[PDB]
Amino acid sequence: DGETVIDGDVEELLLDLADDFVTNVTAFSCRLAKHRKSDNLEARDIQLHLERNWNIRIPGYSADEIRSTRKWNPSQNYNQKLQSITSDKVAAA
């Protein structure tokens, strides 16, 4: 169905894009590795930073510790207040 090729100005543009992408990933990954109170720059920092923000979703290098599973169900005060809101919404009618 056809071959698409690239031109030189687009090559300089995409190479500058990649050149800034590298530093923008590793500068936040260094902050995560320092937030983990360590000194080495492991691969879980980079995989977490690319999973949460860019969602590139690289298959497993350390992607079993990165995969954190919370259910995001609310507290007991919040379901109480939702009961109060539903009670007023049914007592209004």
């Binding site: 500058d16 050149d19 800034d20 530093t23 320092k34």
Partner: protein, 84 residues
């Protein structure tokens, strides 16, 4: 009285200004590296003529930051300046 309470509430709202806790300065890789490279060439080229000391550390010979090993979340730090 509600009058002094209202004027002191409006005095309180007129004094609160927020700053952001995290602001990412819009900059580049390439202009930062080229600034560093040109400053390294022209810093290694000339001399300092100090009063007592010169700025820089090993193989920098310019104004270099003094970020600590801890407190990496601090907003300011010291720099090097030729002290007489």
């Amino acid at each position: 009285t509600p009058e002094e309470e209202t004027t002191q509430v409006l005095n309180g709202v007129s004094r609160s200004f927020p700053l952001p806790l995290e602001s990412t300065v819009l900059s580049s890789v390439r202009y930062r590296t080229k600034y560093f490279r040109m400053r390294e060439m022209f810093a290694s080229s000339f001399s300092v003529k100090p009063g007592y000391t010169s700025p820089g550390y090993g193989a920098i010979h310019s104004r270099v930051g003094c970020l600590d090993l801890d407190r990496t979340t601090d907003y300011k730090f010291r720099v090097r300046t030729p002290q007489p």
